[PDB]
Structure 1
Amino acid sequence: TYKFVNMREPSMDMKSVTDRAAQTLLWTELVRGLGMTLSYLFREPATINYPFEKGPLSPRFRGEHALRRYPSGEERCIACKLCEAVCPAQAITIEAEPRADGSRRTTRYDIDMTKCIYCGFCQEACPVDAIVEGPNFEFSTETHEELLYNKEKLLNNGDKWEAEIAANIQADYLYR
């Protein structure tokens, strides 16, 4: 099925021609829009007072990457390198090693934020929920080197945004 959009040709009686002549001469649709915009002027302005008020978000929000850790304090990352094999932009780099305790943690774990495209593929790839993307988006930096994160920076991110990530995961792990 389909509908013809513009076939409504006008009539030609005296009333219709008088109405059309009035609309053309005594500008009416012009006044119609001019009055609609007036109605929008008196309405309630849609505007959020940044940074005092922030936009609504969701528990699935993808933002700054961070390396979580177990309740015992041990980092969850076992350096399976699945996230490195998954990142479409290849922004993740890991070097692993047999630690002094033995658990295979990352000697190097850096995410190039300028290469990252913020997809959330790493977290869904992680089999221990080690790498995640925190709710933070307020990390606009001044130098390009500031963006290139390190393992220590990722650990600090996971130790600062931690109650956030734990609460969001608790509210989202059932969906995923």
Structure 2
Amino acid sequence: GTERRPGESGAWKQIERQRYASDWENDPTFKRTPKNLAEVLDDSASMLLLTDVWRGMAYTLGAFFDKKVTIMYPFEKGQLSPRFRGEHALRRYPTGEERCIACKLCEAICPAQAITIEAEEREDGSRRTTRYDIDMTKCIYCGFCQEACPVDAIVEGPNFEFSTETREELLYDKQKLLENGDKWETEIATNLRTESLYR
């Protein structure tokens, strides 16, 4: 219970006060004095013989014979949603051409300054990037790039287990981003087939 008692106060000013002033009696939140032999025995059973530890002990013991929520990674995984923002990736069109058209909206919107873009017109007249780099060690995975891109080029893929032994491996270039997109395209397209009703 939440009631209070004299001597169970953890201080000196309050303890010295209550043993030398009956101020706690005026407080209704303090358990009132026992008035008969029965109430005295109840108080003794409360203080001695524990009877407060016993309840929490029993509940924990029941928890011992209870079920668990533990999962066996990597042979089991968790639950996630299509909106999950993971590894940035570059997407193409089904014919095979890059979706990114170097409008540089992603670099403009990125508050992390982790995107470096250089681009010029391709030999066929197409407006394509010449350098597309995103610093994953600097990327904050906010997904604002995925929000800004109007051609669904840059996407944060459902890949999240991409830790490396060296920091240099995380300096993502155009080629590795395109590799990631070609790898994870089907899952991203399936998620977009759901997210399109919200985005």
If the TM-score is normalised by the length of the shorter chain, which range does it land in?
over 0.9
Q: Aligned-pair RMSD on alpha carbons?
A: 1.4
Q: Structure 1 residues 49-58 or 21-30, which shifts more?
A: 21-30
Partner of 2:31: 10
| In structure 1, distance between residues paired with 2:172 and 2:39 | 71
What residue is the counterpart of 1:56 in the other structure? Answer: 79
Q: Relative to 1, partners in 2 of residues 1:105 and 1:17: Cα closer, same or farther, differing over 3 Å?
A: farther
Percent pairwise identity: 72
Partner of 1:75: 98
Match of 1:45 in 2: 68
* CA distance in 2: counterparts of 1:53 and 1:16, whole angstroms: 56
Q: CA deviation at 1:107?
A: 0.4
- Residue 98 of structure 1 corresponds to 121
State the alpha-carbon separation in 2 of the partners of residues 155 and 56 from structure 1.
27
> Which stretch shifts more, 12-21 or 25-34?
12-21
For these two proteins, the number of residue pairs brought into alignment is 172
TM-score (norm 1): 0.93
Letter in 2 for 1:55: G
Bigger RCO (CA 8 Å, 6+ sep): 1
| Displaced runs of 4 or more, over 4 A | none
Alignment deviations for residues 60-103 of structure 1 (CA, whole Å, 9 cap, x no partner): 00100100011211111010111101111111111010011122
Task: Return the TM-score normalized by structure 2.
Answer: 0.82
In structure 1, runs of 5+ residues without a counterpart are: none
- Matches of 2:150 and 2:122 in 1, distance apart? 20
Q: What is the correspondence of 1:1-176 to structure 2 with a 5 Å cutoff?
A: 8-12=29-33, 13-14=35-36, 15-176=38-199
The structure with more radius of gyration: 2
